[PDB]
Structures are given as C-alpha cells and as structure tokens.
Amino acid sequence: GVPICGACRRPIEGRVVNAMGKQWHVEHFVCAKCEKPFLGHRHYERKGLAYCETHYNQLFGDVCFHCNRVIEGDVVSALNKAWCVNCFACSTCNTKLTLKNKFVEFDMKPVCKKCYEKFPLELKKRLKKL
Amino acid sequence: LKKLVEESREKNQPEVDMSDRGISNMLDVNGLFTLSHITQLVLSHNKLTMVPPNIAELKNLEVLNFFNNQIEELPTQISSLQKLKHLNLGMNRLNTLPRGFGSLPALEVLDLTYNNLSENSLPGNFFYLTTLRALYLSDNDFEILPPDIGKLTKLQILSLRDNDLISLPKEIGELTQLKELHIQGNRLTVLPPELGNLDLTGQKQVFKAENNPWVTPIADQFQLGVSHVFEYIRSETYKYLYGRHMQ
Ligand SMILES: [Zn+2]
Ligand SMILES: [Zn+2]
Ligand SMILES: [Zn+2]
Ligand SMILES: [Zn+2]
C-alpha cells in the first residue's frame, strides 16, 4: 500500500521523504551525530547513513598523506596519519603496503622491513634506544 | 635494466621501480631519459654518486626517490620539475644544495634525512618552497635553523632530530599547520616562548624532544607532560627566565 519509514518502521500517511533508496518520515530522517532532522536540507551519504553539512566534514575529512587529497574510499590509519588504500606504501622504496605488512616507524614514517634492514648499523643501534 | 624501459612506454606504466639494481650511473640505464611520460621514479638503494641534468627531461615526475645512494651534488635542473611533489634525498652524502633549488613550485614533501647538511648548505631561495607540508632534516649537522623557516606556512611536519642545534628560531611559532615537531638529540637548552602559540598535544600530533640538555624546570615540565610544557612556556615567569637566559 503506502510507503513505510525505515527508521522507526511504521507506516506513513502524510509527507514522504525519499533518500538512499528508503522512504523516511520527515521528523525521523536525522543525522547520525546530532539527532537533528534535515527537513529538506541536503544530506551526505556515507557507507549507509546520512549526515548534515558540518558533521560529514568533521568525521570523513581524513586526508591522504601521499596524494594530499580527501580520502573517498577506505582509510588506512597508522602513525598519527592516514593513507588511501592504493596510496599507502613504503616511504623509502614506494612499494605498496598494508597494515598486515611488517613495517617500522621512522620519524613517524612507514619503512618496509627490507629497507630498514638496509639501514646503517649505527642508526639502527641509536633507534633501538629511542 | 633494458627490460623495464621498453615495457614502460608501450603499456604506459607511469611508475618505474629500479630499486636495488646496482646502478652507478643513470646514463647507463638504457633509454631511461626517453620516458617523459613517467610520473614516479624509484632509484633507491643503488650506487649513484651524482644526478645528471638529463633528469630535467623527465618533466612529468611527481615522485622522485634517491634514498640511500652516494650522491654528492645535484644539478640546478633538479628544480625544473614542475610536477614534482615528493623528493626523497634521504641517506646520501649531500653537504650542499644547487643554486635556485627552492624554485620547485609544487614540492610538498622534502626528505633530507641522514646527510651532511647545515644551514650553510641551503641556497638563498630555499624557503621559497612555501608549498612544503613535510620537511625532514633528521640526522644532519645544523647548528642554527634560519628564521625563514617561518615562511613555510603550510608545513605540518618538521623533523630536526639528531642535529647540532643550540637554539630554535621563534619563527617556528608562525607554523600554524604543524602537527609533528621532531627535535630530539640536539643541544637545545631552552625553548622560545612563541612555540607556546602552537599546540601539539593532540592524539594525532607529535612532539618528541628527548636527549636535550634542557634547563631543570623545562625538564620537570617534560616529566609532567607535553601539555604542562606548552602551558609553562606561555607563563610570565618563564618569559622573564628566558629573558635572563638570553642576557
Ligand atoms: Zn518514522
Ligand atoms: Zn549532524
Ligand atoms: Zn591517496
Ligand atoms: Zn621499503
């Protein structure tokens, strides 16, 4: 019969909002951070939910350290920094990496195991003590 | 070496990896400087002692990595790479930088870690590199950091680990974008109060400063925490103390 809300799961009789494929009660279509409704203002979809203009800028504005652009895909968080999945690589040989790889921290930069093995002995000995 | 060059233009590989290939001269790399289409060139862990001016022919380079060679000097042509964003010169034998090196208009990340560099190594226009957001000067021989460091307003990361620094310029306080400051292993005794204008206490931020002959109260504040340090260097008593230490 009539469209049904996807937030409270109850039938609608009046104004039907349409977003992300699902129908929404106007007061039940809310941001996931602040419980404020949109009531007509533009929403921002992110992995299934929607946000207001500012919150989406606050919690999805991770910047890639390599290409210096806002990450749209999955974010790789390491050493107080963030990388795109396809941008994350060793800082010394540019070989692509994942968090499942064994890299070392060098001035908060990722260095692949082989490269660190190629490091000078005195440097590694000094880095042990740091 | 004659196989990674022929495959790169017909299949259009923008990224070239020739790391650890026993290369002592880029001119010996057959047809290397005809690959004007490449955007990334990795020549790390080789035996280069110099870089030819032919590097200018690779005008579309965005990532250039010379990590761990024996490079003693660079050509001025190195600053003609208009699309260059990342330049890794870490772990070499550089004690000088070529004339007009700071003419790089798009340089974002500069790594000069582990060389033989001091303040006199920097060209006059070095701090024209206002697009830099990360500068690593770790393991070098800097005694004095030039005030023009304040001109790098987009800098988020600055590493001066294991140098010969006796003092920090107050102009570091002008770096409003700084997230990381590495100043361990120097000969610093006091911090400029202007550093208090910055805030590096965040979980995403970094302030390492161990292995320095700090004055006792600063050391105590370090034993208390970074927040206590920044709070202390803003205080009036510490301003007076700083004024007394200078005089
Ligand atoms: Zn509803
Ligand atoms: Zn919100
Ligand atoms: Zn990226
Ligand atoms: Zn590596």
Author numbering:
A (entry chain B): 189 to 318
B (entry chain A): 5 to 251
Sentences copied from the publication:
Ras suppressor protein 1 (Rsu1), a leucine-rich repeat (LRR)-containing protein conserved from human to worms, was recognized as a major FA component and is important for FA formation and cell motility. Among the IAC components, tripartite integrin-linked kinase (ILK) associates with another two key players PINCH and Parvin to form the ILK/PINCH/Parvin (IPP) complex, which acts as an essential platform to recruit many proteins for the FA formation and signaling and provide a linkage between FA and actin cytoskeleton. Here, we solved the crystal structures of the Rsu1/PINCH1 complex and found that Rsu1 strongly binds to PINCH1 through a large concave surface on its LRR solenoid. The cellular data supported the inhibitory effect of Rsu1 on the IPP complex. These results indicated that Rsu1, by interacting with PINCH1 and preventing PINCH1 from binding to actin, modulates actin dynamics at the FA and thereby regulates the stress fiber formation and cell adhesion dynamics.
We prepared the Rsu1/PINCH1 complex by combinatorial usage of the purified fragments that contains the elements necessary and sufficient for the Rsu1/PINCH1 interaction and successfully obtained the crystals of the Rsu1ΔC/PINCH1_LIM5C and Rsu1/PINCH1_LIM45C complexes. The complex structures of Rsu1ΔC/PINCH1_LIM5C with one crystal form at 1.65 Å resolution and Rsu1/PINCH1_LIM45C with two different crystal forms at 2.2 Å and 3.15 Å resolution respectively were determined by the molecular replacement method. In the Rsu1/PINCH1_LIM45C complex, the nine LRRs of Rsu1 form a curved solenoid capped by the helical regions in the both N- and C-termini, named N-cap and C-cap, respectively. The N-cap consists of the α1-helix while the C-cap contains three α-helices (α2–4). Both the two helical regions cap the LRR-solenoid by forming extensive hydrophobic interactions with LRR1–2 and LRR8–9, respectively. Although lacking the C-terminal half of the LRR-motif, LRR9 remains folded presumably due to the presence of the C-cap. Consistent with our biochemical finding, the LRR-solenoid of Rsu1 interacts with both the LIM5 domain and the C-terminal tail (C-tail, folded as a α-helix) of PINCH1 through the concave surface of the solenoid, mainly formed by the parallel β-sheet and the flanking loop regions. In all three complex structures that we solved, the LIM5C fragment in PINCH1 and the LRRs in Rsu1 showed the essentially same conformation with the overall RMSD of ~0.3 Å. However, the LIM4 domain in PINCH1 adopts different orientations as observed in the two crystal forms of the Rsu1/PINCH1_LIM45C complex, indicating the intrinsic, structural flexibility between the LIM4 and LIM5 domains. The full-length structure of Rsu1 that we solved also provides a valuable information to uncover other binding partner(s) of Rsu1.
